[PDB]
């Protein structure tokens, strides 16, 4: 029963059991009924914690691997790979949900959901790109950019520049350029213009959107400061 | 040091 | 995979904050039947404390929600609490097997510190079982916890200094067992106070690392006494 | 608040 699964997802969150949380929301999505804004948030929060823990772990191991006896380096590499394979499975799960249900069921004028989900698609291809090498890397980098690009065009044409979802897209897209494409001028240009287009009308946002957008703007600023130094 | 990305949730 | 690689893996897991991995590695290390060094013993203890501790934290959240809480809703809450319960029990069972089948077993007559350390740990994981157990199952794990603590306590009193952090640490968890599990606040407070009091006089004789560990435990003893006598 | 128990590690 659908509501039990969502209830479970909420319980898992409170218990900070994010693997459970994501598995519940995965099952909910596969019912092919649309997610409400709260359900969409549960999905997004769950998988971000699941993949986020692995990204964090992967970076620790990767760094150790770099700063370090065949059998010692062999264990480090294998452990890194173990973490990589998990990260890849999680991303594949999310990307399959997005392609087969979430993006698919957005109607022509559900712009916010389209931008939300295409962004998400951009994000999890970006997480794959973080650990990928070679031709597999080219593919996930290309897929990431395409999802970001399509979400960007929708957001520019059909959403206010102050909208948290549009701002959050610009934030992550600019991060893609900086970290994945190593294109610091492109990254800064996207970040700055997004910031600039929103900052004048910030006060026109409602209470909850103003909170969300302010935070994202601060991160845009923080990234610009960091990147231009 | 690394770039900050978007929070997973909305209000 | 050789022993040192398993231990190396446990250290890597720890740095990656992957405590389920960290524990499975030290489980494997233990099962090779060679003794754990003090640092490997620390790896084992930290690993499983995090693994079981996550379950304990989760169980409390769900239990609390369950109590503040529709048949379908409440049944899912219960089922989910039980899910967490069965994980917690599986983890404790693993540790307790490690203790009974290798770690306590391979302590020789005069390896007192290790005996106290492992018997304390046995008391701990039976205590975590007791935290969620009900009925006849509960009585069994409470009695097993008490037995382990009681034996570690006697060894510690006869063969260790009152200032030793392992001894102090045992008295701490043993008094917590009395307070939280047996609801015996008088026994709890007496044990905590005497343990604290016995360690004062020669505290400055401790090695600098031991001093650090013991003063921390003594602060926890005191914090507990204050909380229990409020 | 609950009772505090022993740290899992030694120095
Ligand atoms: Mg503006
Ligand atoms: Na003995």
Domain boundaries, chain A: 1-229
Which of A152, A195, A209 lies closest to A176, judged by CA? A152
Distance CA C185, CA C229 (A): 9
**Hey, are the CB atoms on A168 and B7 less than 8 Å from each other?**
yes
The gap from C-alpha A28 to its chain's centroid, in whole angstroms, comes to 20
User: Hey, CA dihedral for A147, A153, A156, A159, is it positive or negative?
Assistant: negative
Q: What is the largest CA-CA distance in chain D?
A: 27
Q: Which residue shows structure tokens 């120095």? A: D11
Q: Is C73 on the interface with A (CB under 8 A)?
A: yes
Q: C39: how many CB neighbours lie within 10 A of its CB? A: 12
Give alpha helix (H) positions in A32-110: 37-67, 70-97
Question: Which H helix or E strand runs over A207?
Answer: helix A207-227
Distance CA A8, CA C72 (A): 11
**Residues A79, C12: contact at Cβ < 8 Å?**
yes
User: Hey, CA dihedral for D6, D7, D8, D10, is it positive or negative?
Assistant: negative
Distance CA C76, CA A206 (A): 36
Distance CA C155, CA A214 (A): 61
Is the domain spanning A1-229 CATH 3.30.530.20? The answer is no
User: Of C38, C45, C224, which has the smallest distance from its Cβ to D3's Cβ?
Assistant: C224
Instruction: Give C100's DSSP letter.
Output: I
**Hey, are the CB atoms on A41 and B10 less than 8 Å from each other?**
yes
Which residues does D7 contact at the CB level (< 8 Å), separation at least 6? C169, C213, C216, C217
Distance CA C127, CA C173 (A): 9
CA atoms within 13 A on the CB side of A219: 22
Burial letters for C200-218: b for 16+ Cβ neighbours within 10 Å, e otherwise?
eeeeeebeeebbebbebbb
User: Of D3, D4, D8, which has the smallest distance from its Cβ to C49's Cβ?
Assistant: D8
Task: Give contacts of C15 with chain A, Cβ < 8 Å.
Answer: 60-61, 64
User: Hey, CA dihedral for C168, C174, C177, C178, is it positive or negative?
Assistant: negative
Q: CB contacts < 8 Å between A and B, how many?
A: 48
Which of B5, C96, C125 lies closest to A127, judged by CA? B5
- Pairs from A71-78 (Cβ < 8 Å, separation ≥ 24): A71/C2, A71/C4, A71/C5, A72/C5, A72/C8, A74/C5, A75/C1, A75/C5, A75/C8, A75/C9, A75/C12, A76/C8, A76/C12
**How far off is chain D from C169, nearest CA to CA, in Å?**
5
Which of A203, A202, A199 lies closest to A221, judged by CA? A199
Quote the radius of gyration of chain B (alpha carbons, Å): 9
CA atoms within 13 A on the CB side of C91: 27
Burial of A31 (0-12, 13-18, 19+ CB in 10 A): exposed
Instruction: Give C204's DSSP letter.
Output: G
Three-class secondary structure of residue C133 per DSSP? coil
Structure tokens at A96: 């399959």
Distance CA C27, CA C47 (A): 10
User: Of C9, C18, C77, which has the smallest distance from its Cβ to A57's Cβ?
Assistant: C18
* CATH of span C1-230: 1.20.190.20
Q: C42: how many CB neighbours lie within 10 A of its CB? A: 17
Discontinuities in chain D with C to N beyond 2.5 Å fall right after none
Distance CA C170, CA A191 (A): 56
Task: Give contacts of A3 with chain C, Cβ < 8 Å.
Answer: 72
């Amino acid at each position: 029963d659908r509501e039990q699964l969502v209830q479970k997802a909420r319980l898992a969150e409170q218990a900070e059991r994010y693997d459970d949380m994501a598995a519940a929301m995965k099952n909910v999505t596969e019912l092919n009924e649309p997610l409400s804004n709260e359900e969409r948030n549960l999905l997004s929060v769950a998988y971000k914690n699941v993949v986020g823990a692995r990204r964090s772990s992967w970076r620790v191991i990767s760094s150790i691997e770099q700063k370090t006896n065949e059998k010692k380096i062999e264990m480090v590499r294998a452990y890194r790979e173990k973490i990589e394979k998990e990260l890849e499975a999680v991303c594949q799960d999310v990307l399959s949900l997005l392609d087969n249900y979430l993006i698919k069921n957005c109607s022509e004028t559900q712009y916010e959901s389209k931008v939300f989900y295409l962004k998400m698609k951009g994000d999890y291809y970006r997480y794959l790109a973080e650990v990928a090498t070679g031709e597999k890397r080219a593919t996930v980098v290309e897929s990431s950019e395409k999802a970001y690009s399509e979400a960007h065009e929708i957001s520019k044409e059909h959403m206010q520049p102050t909208h948290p979802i549009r701002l959050g897209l610009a934030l992550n897209y600019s991060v893609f350029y900086y970290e994945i494409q190593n294109a610091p001028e492109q990254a800064c240009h996207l970040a700055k213009t997004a910031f600039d287009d929103a900052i004048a009308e910030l006060d026109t946002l409602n209470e909850d959107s103003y909170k969300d957008s302010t935070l994202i703007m601060q991160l845009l600023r923080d990234n610009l400061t960091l990147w231009t130094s | 040091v690394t770039s900050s990305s978007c929070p997973a949730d909305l209000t």
